[PDB]
Design a protein around this ligand. Structure first.
Ligand SMILES: CC(=O)c1ccc(N2CCC(C(=O)c3cccc(Cl)c3)CC2)cc1
Ligand SMILES: *Cc1c(COP(=O)(O)O)cnc(C)c1O
Ligand SMILES: *Cc1c(COP(=O)(O)O)cnc(C)c1O
Lengths: 429, 429
């Protein structure tokens, strides 16, 4: 047992936080004491208050926290089998989830490699790509190409394809692998951009294993949207120059952008696909990398004879079982209508912010709404402002944005957007 | 799904650790339950109870379905499944960090949670690199280790795995080129330390850290070495200003007969990794610890923060079960328990020394190893162990067990007996 003041003291002395310091934090983290449905209970001024989880706890809690169908799924699997090692053994949660995932992902993705986090699945995807070409007799095809503004995780190979500014690649001189970056993909469809991308790829094609991109929505590198037709062009470019196509859908997966997977907006299939954040409905760390049969078999007929990867908790029965329920719960409802209503709620709620002086853009894609500002957002002001309106918001750089749980009612969206609009109002003054 | 349906889905759609698709010499065995030290597996259409001699890849130290860990999981499930750790903190993270800081080797004061051992190793290297950049020495960017080690499957972690065990021939031009000392011997030889120092001297100015598994090298070959090499590593790292990283992902939480294997030598590293048994084998979770000095130096450096933050960082569910797991270990007389486990393994395995295909028998804590004169054919060893009521997973030429701590004397003798028979069959044919 610990009181919130003891939690804060232990935290200050011993807990790293994401991209944080020890002992140089501008403001203490806020003690969370509960989380239920779309709502978190936080400690402000020593008192518990309920606020909306407008971030879905970093894209994860698509069905809300403590959903009874996913609680029960975890409690049911807990009674039979917490976990078994996946070396030499298999089980029902893994098979059911793999069945579900191959069926609902874009066509052609037939095999599923489970891991523990999104960064790992990305490295698994890269390893798949590199082993694929070795099994084709082309070990020179070993670099990655991407477009600027992306984000793919914090492990060192993943870092190498993150946006060089967002990723502070200047601080990693002579450390990261040197990958090929095309310019920032634009919002509106411009075929000249795809032509330029093709030309740059063409001169690297013989050393490129793969193109890796987030489809439609670029999350942590800047909450930028692009026309899905760009994905159509990458597919055709990759096919023509014999470079594999990897879609990182770790933030876009499972309905978040209006389609079940963002690749579906373009009607295109990658050779390799990563999923993660929402996979367990925000309960537990789990990820997966999927590839075509051709990739699977080429790796397996490779001289190495196998994919050299195997996380200790691979295909954890507890995380697979809740993920099964999370996916079935999503497919078991009219999810497409649900996201459309959420998008319309966000569009209506944030429209006020366009006319505000400090706002350069307001954009919505499925259950994602963004207010882009003309200067950094001072969190020391934005966080108390949103809390006083009962909304948990976490701006970064010049972005005030939300990815709310799918269960948010119209009133809760209106509360979330009103808080975002007000945060943007204070950016001016 | 039935076992047969699971088998069909699995063969079609699941990757397994370091495996192929559709080229598996053996099918996986369907596991349907796990309780205490026992797995329920399906063999010839029938369920059987077998001992989990591997502890499900060295994780299930308290056995499966321990009431204390089950309840800690359901209790946390009732209040809060997960919140984002960016901007927020919570009780299971604070308690777990206070626990780990208090029981790890002295001076390890800060805790970075992540979701797997591989990621925690990348976090450690990132800490070491950002540390020296904080000190104005950004040329200290390489790693040194001794051959025979294993540290995970992500690409930085791969770079310090044994260049044969990790098939580094298959990963040249891709992996960072690290500094490898020869295989550390089992008996203490002061000359090996002298040569290690001499090699490290020729690289000090480009070395960020020495990274080793302490006392026991797990996946690279279940090799033991004398603890006093860790004393020499500590002193050499001290005099040459190279940080010391201990990877205790396999050795932590009592496995080798001390709480952490570093304690066999009284040594404290600068950075420490833990993972496998951290949650008692329930959920994926890992932690990287470092000293106040490393943390304060990173935090005062150019980035002002450690450049890392996993989506599920400090997952309340995983942390809560780990709290229970660590407290359950601390609140019993674990040292006597592991001492008794080790005696049972030693007495039970002694008879294998005389088998013709056996080259060594060695025990260290709750770890027992029969080294054979040839690679062990899993198609012979697996059914033969299952015939004896034991789940065994040999690799390379090693028949070994890492049994759950709750194994009674008779269960240990049942485990060692199956291992002895497996080794007897190796020299038969
Ligand atoms: C779970 C949680 O609460 C959480 C909060 C924040 C968070 N970050 C912080 C900002 C980071 C960032 O901008 C960035 C870093 C490297 C490359 C690029 Cl392109 C962008 C991205 C991750 C991760 C997790
Ligand atoms: C969050 C994220 C990752 C990394 O996921 P982790 O589980 O934090 O490693 C990778 N790619 C994308 C697109 C993401 O949004
Ligand atoms: C098992 C292990 C790892 C990898 O942990 P994962 O969770 O499987 O990534 C790393 N280092 C050591 C010493 C290990 O035993």
């Amino acid at each position: 047992g610990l009181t919130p003041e003891q939690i804060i003291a232990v935290d200050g002395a011993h807990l790293w936080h994401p991209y944080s310091s020890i002992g140089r934090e501008a403001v203490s983290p806020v003690v969370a004491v509960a989380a239920h449905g779309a709502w978190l209970t936080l400690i402000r001024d020593g008192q518990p208050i309920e606020v909306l989880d407008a971030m879905s706890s970093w894209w994860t809690a698509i069905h809300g926290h403590g959903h009874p169908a996913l609680d029960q799924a975890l409690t049911t699997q807990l009674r039979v089998m917490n976990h078994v090692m996946f070396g030499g053994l298999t089980h029902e949660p893994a098979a059911r989830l793999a069945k579900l995932l191959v069926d609902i992902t874009p066509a052609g993705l037939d095999t599923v490699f489970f891991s523990d986090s999104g960064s790992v699945s990305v490295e698994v995807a890269a390893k798949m790509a590199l082993q694929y070409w070795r099994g084709r007799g082309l070990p020179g095809k070993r670099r990655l190409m991407t477009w600027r503004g992306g984000y793919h995780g914090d492990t060192f190979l993943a870092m190498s394809i993150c946006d060089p500014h967002g990723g502070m690649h200047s601080l990693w001189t002579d450390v990261l692998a040197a990958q090929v970056f095309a310019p920032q993909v634009p919002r509106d469809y411009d075929p000249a951009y795809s032509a330029a991308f093709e030309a740059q790829l063409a001169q690297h094609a013989g050393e490129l294993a793969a193109v890796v991109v987030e489809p439609v929505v670029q999350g942590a590198g800047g909450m930028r949207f692009h026309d899905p037709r760009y994905l159509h062009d990458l597919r055709d470019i990759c096919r023509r120059y014999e470079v594999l196509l990897i879609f990182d859908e770790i933030a876009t997966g499972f309905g978040r952008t209006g389609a079940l997977f963002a690749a579906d907006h373009a009607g295109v299939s990658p050779d390799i696909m990563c999923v993660g954040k929402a996979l367990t409905g925000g309960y537990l760390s789990l990820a997966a990398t999927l590839c075509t049969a051709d990739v699977a078999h080429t790796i397996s007929a490779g001289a190495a004879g196998a994919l050299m990867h195997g996380p200790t908790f691979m295909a954890n029965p507890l995380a697979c079982a809740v993920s099964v329920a999370s996916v079935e719960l999503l497919l078991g409802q009219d999810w497409r209508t649900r996201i459309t209503e959420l998008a319309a709620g966000l569009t209506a709620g944030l429209d006020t912010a366009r006319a505000l002086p400090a706002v350069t853009d307001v954009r919505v894609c499925g259950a994602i709404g963004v207010i882009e500002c003309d200067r950094p957002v001072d969190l020391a002001v934005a966080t108390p402002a949103a809390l006083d309106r009962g909304v948990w918001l976490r701006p970064f750089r010049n972005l005030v944005y939300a990815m709310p749980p799918y269960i948010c009612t119209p009133a809760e969206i209106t509360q979330i957007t009103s808080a975002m609009v007000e945060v943007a109002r204070l950016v001016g003054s």
